[PDB]
């Protein structure tokens, strides 16, 4: 007999979401490792409980039916680890403030879990219904965190829930509006896609929902980010919810690897063929890099950094063929054993914030004022592919598509270069201790 003995129960019904553990469209066949084989399919975050007095006239589209059997129901009360057939649900409502506050209020132990298939979450900030269907299995506006073979280990150290989560697979995040113009990350295997510590939303780590989410993903394999339409289409969707169309946390995002295939494309957005700047630019199979540091609030009062490091990365840039094909920096400098390497630093400051000595100080002052940036420290790169032309190709690309890339961020910016040895391939480079400014 399909004993239906479950419904909405007492719970902290959030402002934006209704706390109602509903087992809908499921034969709840229940027949200290106490197992009651069940079907919790149908848990729905219909949500919209705050707007328009629950918005009863228009219930939110984000709803889940048959969201995972979870039949095994491993373990019982005592580290309440559960081996399940349901991965997770997706709060398609704003995953910055409302969903974060709901999660923080609900969490207010060290339980673990082991899901199956990595539901295709579509938190946008019936797609969430697709996420629920994928939990049953577990162009744009297609933000998807779907580890096909979910190796999620929800550490969930609630002891102020200093939670954690280590996975062996990765998502595919086409992050877009509410032309293949978004990122296309395809990390997949554990080292190949070592997704780690995705969310905290707990007052213990930080004191949005006080995340302090050190998502220091440390992978060491291909994990190709095949396409990346823009860096900016990334600051807007992170500070604001999202303002694209068809067209107190401190997010410390660290990433170190010997090898991680990657594509970097500039940001030329209408709000602030393809983008003009750096046509066909690829930091191919370079070091993983692209480590960021962001914040939920728009116009970050603290500055935003974006670092990079690489020993001899074979980044085919502006590819015909790279104008510079390897960092090639064997430049020991200090008294101790040192090996200098390249870096591409970025330092963005909020909009409307607040010659050995002449040329240096003038552009230092110009660097203290930021509406965009760019920075390079190449010790001995000096490189160029055998197919390259400093006379022609560099002129045709890195001088035309250089500053006309919608330079503005929240067009007073700066630029530096520094080389201890240079080679202008094709011819008298003669370069030692040289720079370039703008």
Coordinates of C-alpha atoms in Angstrom, one line a residue:
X1 CA 0.0 0.0 0.0
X2 CA 1.2 3.5 -1.0
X3 CA 1.0 5.0 2.5
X4 CA 1.0 8.8 2.0
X5 CA 1.9 10.0 5.5
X6 CA 3.7 13.3 4.9
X7 CA 2.8 16.9 4.1
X8 CA 3.7 20.5 4.9
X9 CA 4.9 20.7 8.5
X10 CA 6.1 23.3 11.0
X11 CA 9.1 25.1 9.7
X12 CA 10.8 28.5 9.4
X13 CA 8.9 29.7 6.3
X14 CA 11.3 32.2 4.9
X15 CA 10.3 35.6 3.5
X16 CA 10.9 34.5 -0.1
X17 CA 10.3 30.8 0.3
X18 CA 7.7 28.7 2.1
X19 CA 9.2 26.0 4.4
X20 CA 7.0 23.0 3.5
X21 CA 8.5 19.6 3.1
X22 CA 6.0 18.1 0.6
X23 CA 6.4 14.6 -0.7
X24 CA 4.2 15.0 -3.8
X25 CA 3.6 12.5 -6.7
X26 CA 5.4 9.9 -4.7
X27 CA 4.3 6.5 -3.3
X28 CA 5.9 6.9 0.1
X29 CA 6.2 3.2 0.6
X30 CA 7.8 2.8 4.0
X31 CA 8.2 -0.9 4.6
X32 CA 21.3 3.1 14.6
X33 CA 21.1 2.3 10.9
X34 CA 17.3 2.7 10.8
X35 CA 16.2 2.7 7.2
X36 CA 12.6 3.5 6.1
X37 CA 12.7 3.1 2.3
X38 CA 10.8 6.1 0.9
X39 CA 10.3 8.5 -1.9
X40 CA 10.8 12.2 -0.9
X41 CA 10.3 13.2 -4.6
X42 CA 8.4 16.4 -5.0
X43 CA 10.0 18.7 -2.5
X44 CA 9.2 22.1 -4.0
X45 CA 10.6 25.6 -3.4
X46 CA 7.6 27.3 -4.9
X47 CA 8.8 30.3 -2.9
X48 CA 7.6 33.9 -3.7
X49 CA 6.2 34.0 -0.1
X50 CA 7.2 37.7 0.5
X51 CA 6.2 39.5 -2.8
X52 CA 2.6 40.7 -3.2
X53 CA 1.6 38.9 0.0
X54 CA 2.9 35.5 -1.1
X55 CA 2.0 36.5 -4.7
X56 CA -1.0 34.3 -4.6
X57 CA -2.2 35.7 -7.9
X58 CA 1.1 34.5 -9.6
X59 CA 2.9 31.6 -7.9
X60 CA 6.5 31.5 -8.9
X61 CA 7.5 29.4 -11.9
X62 CA 10.4 27.8 -10.0
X63 CA 8.9 24.7 -8.6
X64 CA 10.0 21.1 -8.3
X65 CA 8.0 17.9 -8.7
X66 CA 9.5 14.4 -8.4
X67 CA 12.8 15.8 -7.2
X68 CA 14.6 12.6 -6.5
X69 CA 13.6 9.3 -4.9
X70 CA 16.1 9.5 -2.0
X71 CA 14.8 6.0 -1.3
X72 CA 17.7 4.5 0.7
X73 CA 17.4 7.1 3.5
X74 CA 20.7 5.9 5.1
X75 CA 21.3 6.1 8.8
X76 CA 19.2 7.8 11.5
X77 CA 19.5 10.1 14.5
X78 CA 22.4 9.8 16.9
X79 CA 27.2 12.5 11.3
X80 CA 23.8 11.5 9.9
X81 CA 25.3 10.5 6.5
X82 CA 22.7 9.7 3.9
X83 CA 23.3 7.7 0.7
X84 CA 20.6 9.1 -1.6
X85 CA 19.0 9.0 -5.0
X86 CA 18.2 12.8 -4.9
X87 CA 20.9 15.3 -5.5
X88 CA 19.5 18.7 -4.6
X89 CA 16.9 21.4 -5.6
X90 CA 17.5 24.8 -7.2
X91 CA 16.2 28.1 -5.8
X92 CA 15.8 29.9 -9.2
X93 CA 14.9 33.0 -7.1
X94 CA 17.8 35.3 -6.5
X95 CA 20.8 33.1 -5.3
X96 CA 22.5 36.2 -3.9
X97 CA 20.2 37.5 -1.2
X98 CA 16.8 35.7 -0.8
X99 CA 18.0 32.2 -1.2
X100 CA 21.2 32.9 0.9
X101 CA 19.1 34.4 3.7
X102 CA 16.7 31.4 3.5
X103 CA 19.6 29.0 3.8
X104 CA 21.2 30.9 6.7
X105 CA 17.9 31.0 8.6
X106 CA 17.3 27.3 8.0
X107 CA 20.8 26.3 9.1
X108 CA 20.9 28.7 12.1
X109 CA 26.6 18.6 13.7
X110 CA 28.8 17.1 11.0
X111 CA 26.3 15.3 8.8
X112 CA 27.6 13.9 5.5
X113 CA 25.8 12.8 2.3
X114 CA 26.5 11.0 -0.9
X115 CA 24.2 12.0 -3.8
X116 CA 24.0 10.3 -7.2
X117 CA 23.9 12.5 -10.3
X118 CA 24.4 16.2 -9.7
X119 CA 21.1 18.0 -10.5
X120 CA 21.3 20.8 -13.1
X121 CA 20.7 23.7 -10.8
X122 CA 19.5 26.8 -12.6
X123 CA 19.5 29.5 -10.0
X124 CA 18.9 32.7 -12.1
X125 CA 20.3 35.8 -10.5
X126 CA 10.6 25.6 -15.3
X127 CA 14.4 25.6 -15.3
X128 CA 14.3 24.9 -11.6
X129 CA 11.8 22.1 -12.6
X130 CA 14.5 20.8 -14.9
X131 CA 16.9 20.9 -11.9
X132 CA 14.4 18.9 -9.9
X133 CA 14.1 16.4 -12.7
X134 CA 17.9 16.1 -12.7
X135 CA 17.7 15.6 -8.9
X136 CA 15.4 12.7 -9.8
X137 CA 18.3 11.7 -12.1
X138 CA 20.5 12.5 -9.1
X139 CA 21.4 30.0 -25.5
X140 CA 21.3 32.3 -22.4
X141 CA 19.9 32.3 -18.8
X142 CA 21.3 28.7 -18.6
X143 CA 23.4 29.0 -15.5
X144 CA 23.9 25.3 -14.7
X145 CA 25.8 23.6 -11.9
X146 CA 25.5 20.0 -13.1
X147 CA 28.2 17.5 -12.1
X148 CA 27.0 14.6 -14.1
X149 CA 28.6 12.0 -11.7
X150 CA 28.1 13.9 -8.5
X151 CA 30.9 13.1 -6.0
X152 CA 29.5 15.7 -3.5
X153 CA 30.6 15.1 0.1
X154 CA 28.5 17.6 2.0
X155 CA 30.7 18.0 5.1
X156 CA 28.0 20.2 6.6
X157 CA 30.0 20.9 9.8
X158 CA 27.2 22.8 11.5
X159 CA 29.5 23.6 14.5
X160 CA 27.5 29.1 12.8
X161 CA 27.5 26.2 10.3
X162 CA 31.2 26.1 9.2
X163 CA 30.1 23.9 6.4
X164 CA 32.3 22.4 3.6
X165 CA 31.9 20.4 0.4
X166 CA 34.5 18.5 -1.6
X167 CA 33.5 17.1 -5.1
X168 CA 35.4 15.2 -7.8
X169 CA 33.4 16.8 -10.7
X170 CA 32.6 20.2 -12.1
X171 CA 29.7 22.2 -13.4
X172 CA 29.1 23.9 -16.8
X173 CA 28.2 27.5 -16.1
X174 CA 26.8 29.4 -19.0
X175 CA 26.1 32.5 -16.9
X176 CA 23.9 34.9 -18.8
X177 CA 20.8 37.1 -18.6
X178 CA 17.8 36.6 -16.3
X179 CA 25.8 33.9 -29.4
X180 CA 27.8 31.6 -27.1
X181 CA 28.7 34.8 -25.3
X182 CA 29.1 33.3 -21.8
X183 CA 31.7 31.1 -20.1
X184 CA 31.6 27.4 -21.0
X185 CA 33.5 25.8 -18.2
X186 CA 33.7 22.0 -18.6
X187 CA 35.7 20.7 -15.6
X188 CA 35.3 16.9 -15.4
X189 CA 37.2 13.9 -14.1
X190 CA 39.1 13.9 -8.6
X191 CA 41.9 16.3 -9.5
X192 CA 40.6 17.0 -13.0
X193 CA 37.6 18.9 -11.5
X194 CA 38.3 19.4 -7.8
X195 CA 35.3 21.5 -7.0
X196 CA 35.6 22.6 -3.3
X197 CA 33.6 24.5 -0.8
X198 CA 31.0 26.0 -3.1
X199 CA 28.8 27.7 -0.5
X200 CA 28.9 28.6 3.1
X201 CA 26.2 31.2 3.9
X202 CA 27.2 30.9 7.6
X203 CA 27.9 33.6 10.2
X204 CA 30.9 31.5 11.5
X205 CA 33.0 32.0 8.3
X206 CA 32.1 35.6 7.8
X207 CA 30.7 38.1 10.2
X208 CA 25.0 38.6 1.1
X209 CA 24.6 35.9 3.8
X210 CA 28.1 36.3 5.3
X211 CA 29.7 33.6 3.1
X212 CA 33.5 34.0 3.3
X213 CA 33.3 31.3 0.7
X214 CA 36.9 30.4 0.0
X215 CA 36.1 28.4 -3.1
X216 CA 39.8 27.8 -3.6
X217 CA 39.3 25.1 -6.3
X218 CA 42.7 23.5 -6.7
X219 CA 42.5 21.3 -9.8
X220 CA 45.5 20.1 -11.8
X221 CA 44.1 18.9 -15.2
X222 CA 42.7 20.1 -18.5
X223 CA 39.4 21.4 -17.1
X224 CA 38.9 23.4 -20.3
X225 CA 37.1 26.7 -20.2
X226 CA 36.6 26.5 -24.0
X227 CA 34.8 29.8 -24.5
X228 CA 34.5 33.0 -22.5
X229 CA 32.7 35.8 -24.1
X230 CA 33.5 38.4 -21.4
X231 CA 35.1 39.3 -18.0
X232 CA 32.7 42.2 -17.4
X233 CA 29.6 40.1 -18.0
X234 CA 31.0 38.5 -14.9
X235 CA 31.3 41.5 -12.6
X236 CA 27.7 42.7 -13.3
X237 CA 26.1 39.3 -12.7
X238 CA 28.1 39.0 -9.4
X239 CA 27.5 42.5 -8.0
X240 CA 24.0 43.1 -9.3
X241 CA 21.7 40.2 -9.8
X242 CA 21.9 40.4 -13.6
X243 CA 21.2 43.0 -16.2
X244 CA 21.9 41.2 -19.5
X245 CA 19.5 40.4 -22.3
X246 CA 19.3 38.4 -25.5
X247 CA 22.0 40.7 -27.1
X248 CA 29.5 40.8 4.1
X249 CA 31.2 37.9 2.4
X250 CA 34.8 38.1 1.0
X251 CA 34.8 35.6 -2.0
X252 CA 38.5 34.5 -2.1
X253 CA 38.7 32.5 -5.4
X254 CA 42.1 30.7 -5.6
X255 CA 43.2 28.4 -8.4
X256 CA 46.6 26.8 -8.8
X257 CA 47.6 24.0 -11.3
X258 CA 50.4 23.0 -13.6
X259 CA 48.0 22.5 -16.5
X260 CA 44.5 23.9 -17.2
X261 CA 43.4 24.6 -20.7
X262 CA 41.9 28.1 -20.9
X263 CA 40.5 30.9 -23.2
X264 CA 40.6 34.5 -22.3
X265 CA 38.5 37.1 -24.1
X266 CA 38.2 40.7 -23.3
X267 CA 35.2 42.5 -22.1
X268 CA 33.5 44.8 -24.6
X269 CA 29.9 45.2 -23.4
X270 CA 27.2 47.6 -24.5
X271 CA 26.2 48.5 -20.9
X272 CA 29.8 49.4 -19.9
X273 CA 32.5 39.0 -35.3
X274 CA 33.0 39.5 -31.6
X275 CA 34.5 42.0 -29.2
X276 CA 37.1 44.2 -30.9
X277 CA 39.8 43.9 -28.2
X278 CA 42.4 41.1 -28.7
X279 CA 40.8 39.1 -31.5
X280 CA 41.2 35.4 -31.0
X281 CA 43.1 35.7 -27.7
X282 CA 43.9 32.4 -26.0
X283 CA 45.9 31.6 -23.0
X284 CA 45.9 28.0 -24.1
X285 CA 47.0 25.2 -21.7
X286 CA 48.6 27.7 -19.5
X287 CA 48.7 27.5 -15.7
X288 CA 45.1 27.5 -14.3
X289 CA 45.2 31.0 -12.9
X290 CA 42.2 33.3 -13.3
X291 CA 41.9 33.5 -9.6
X292 CA 39.5 36.3 -8.5
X293 CA 38.3 38.1 -5.4
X294 CA 34.8 39.6 -5.5
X295 CA 31.9 40.8 -3.4
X296 CA 28.1 40.7 -3.5
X297 CA 27.4 44.4 -3.2
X298 CA 27.7 46.6 -6.3
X299 CA 30.5 49.1 -6.4
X300 CA 32.8 47.2 -4.0
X301 CA 34.2 49.6 -1.4
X302 CA 37.3 47.4 -1.2
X303 CA 39.3 47.0 -4.5
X304 CA 38.9 44.0 -6.7
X305 CA 42.1 42.0 -7.6
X306 CA 42.7 39.5 -10.4
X307 CA 46.1 37.9 -10.4
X308 CA 47.9 35.4 -12.6
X309 CA 51.2 33.5 -12.7
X310 CA 52.9 31.3 -15.2
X311 CA 56.4 29.9 -15.6
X312 CA 56.7 29.4 -19.4
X313 CA 53.0 29.2 -20.3
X314 CA 52.4 28.4 -24.0
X315 CA 49.6 30.9 -24.4
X316 CA 48.9 31.4 -28.1
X317 CA 47.8 35.1 -28.1
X318 CA 45.8 36.9 -30.7
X319 CA 46.0 33.8 -33.0
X320 CA 48.3 34.3 -37.5
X321 CA 49.9 32.4 -34.5
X322 CA 50.9 34.0 -31.2
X323 CA 52.7 37.3 -31.1
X324 CA 54.3 35.9 -27.9
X325 CA 54.2 32.1 -27.5
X326 CA 55.8 31.4 -24.1
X327 CA 56.7 33.2 -20.9
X328 CA 60.2 31.7 -21.2
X329 CA 61.4 33.5 -18.0
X330 CA 64.7 32.0 -16.7
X331 CA 65.6 35.2 -14.8
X332 CA 67.0 34.6 -11.3
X333 CA 67.2 37.9 -9.5
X334 CA 67.6 37.7 -5.7
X335 CA 70.5 36.4 -3.6
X336 CA 68.5 33.3 -2.8
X337 CA 67.4 30.8 -5.5
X338 CA 64.7 32.6 -7.4
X339 CA 62.9 31.9 -10.7
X340 CA 61.1 34.9 -12.1
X341 CA 57.8 34.3 -13.9
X342 CA 55.1 36.3 -15.7
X343 CA 51.9 37.8 -14.3
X344 CA 48.8 39.7 -15.5
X345 CA 47.5 41.7 -12.6
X346 CA 44.2 43.7 -12.5
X347 CA 43.1 46.1 -9.8
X348 CA 39.7 47.7 -10.2
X349 CA 38.5 50.5 -8.0
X350 CA 34.9 51.7 -7.6
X351 CA 33.7 54.4 -10.0
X352 CA 33.6 57.9 -8.5
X353 CA 35.6 56.7 -5.6
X354 CA 36.4 59.4 -3.0
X355 CA 62.5 59.8 -16.6
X356 CA 63.3 57.6 -13.6
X357 CA 61.2 59.6 -11.2
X358 CA 58.9 61.7 -13.5
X359 CA 57.5 58.9 -15.7
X360 CA 57.4 56.4 -12.8
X361 CA 55.6 58.7 -10.3
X362 CA 53.2 60.1 -12.9
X363 CA 51.9 56.7 -13.9
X364 CA 51.9 55.6 -10.2
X365 CA 49.5 58.4 -9.5
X366 CA 47.6 57.4 -12.6
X367 CA 47.5 53.8 -11.2
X368 CA 46.1 55.1 -7.9
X369 CA 43.0 56.2 -9.9
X370 CA 41.2 53.2 -11.5
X371 CA 38.2 52.8 -13.8
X372 CA 39.9 49.9 -15.5
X373 CA 43.5 48.5 -15.5
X374 CA 46.0 46.1 -17.1
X375 CA 49.5 45.1 -15.8
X376 CA 52.3 42.8 -16.9
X377 CA 55.6 41.8 -15.4
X378 CA 57.5 39.8 -18.0
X379 CA 61.1 39.0 -16.8
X380 CA 62.5 37.5 -19.9
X381 CA 59.4 36.5 -22.0
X382 CA 60.5 38.5 -25.1
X383 CA 58.9 35.6 -27.0
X384 CA 57.3 35.3 -30.4
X385 CA 56.1 32.3 -32.3
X386 CA 58.0 31.3 -35.5
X387 CA 55.0 32.6 -37.3
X388 CA 54.8 36.1 -35.9
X389 CA 55.4 39.7 -37.0
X390 CA 56.2 42.5 -34.5
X391 CA 56.3 45.0 -37.4
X392 CA 52.8 44.2 -38.7
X393 CA 50.6 41.9 -36.5
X394 CA 51.4 43.7 -33.2
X395 CA 50.4 47.0 -34.9
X396 CA 47.3 45.5 -36.4
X397 CA 46.0 44.0 -33.2
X398 CA 47.6 45.1 -29.9
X399 CA 47.5 48.8 -30.9
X400 CA 44.1 49.1 -32.6
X401 CA 42.1 46.7 -30.3
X402 CA 43.8 48.0 -27.1
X403 CA 41.8 50.8 -25.4
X404 CA 38.5 50.7 -27.4
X405 CA 37.1 47.9 -25.4
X406 CA 34.5 49.9 -23.5
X407 CA 37.0 50.9 -20.8
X408 CA 34.9 51.7 -17.7
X409 CA 34.1 49.9 -14.4
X410 CA 32.8 50.5 -10.9
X411 CA 37.9 55.8 -18.4
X412 CA 40.7 56.7 -16.0
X413 CA 42.8 53.6 -16.1
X414 CA 46.5 52.7 -16.3
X415 CA 48.9 50.2 -17.9
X416 CA 52.5 49.0 -17.3
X417 CA 55.0 46.6 -18.8
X418 CA 58.4 45.6 -17.4
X419 CA 61.0 43.4 -19.2
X420 CA 64.6 42.5 -18.3
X421 CA 65.3 41.1 -21.8
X422 CA 63.4 41.7 -25.0
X423 CA 63.3 40.2 -28.5
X424 CA 61.6 41.9 -31.4
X425 CA 61.3 38.9 -33.7
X426 CA 60.5 39.1 -37.4
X427 CA 65.4 43.4 -35.9
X428 CA 67.7 45.0 -33.3
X429 CA 65.8 44.4 -30.1
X430 CA 68.7 45.1 -27.8
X431 CA 66.2 45.2 -25.0
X432 CA 67.2 45.1 -21.3
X433 CA 65.3 46.9 -18.6
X434 CA 62.5 48.2 -20.8
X435 CA 58.9 49.3 -20.2
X436 CA 55.7 50.6 -22.0
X437 CA 53.2 53.0 -20.5
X438 CA 49.7 54.3 -21.3

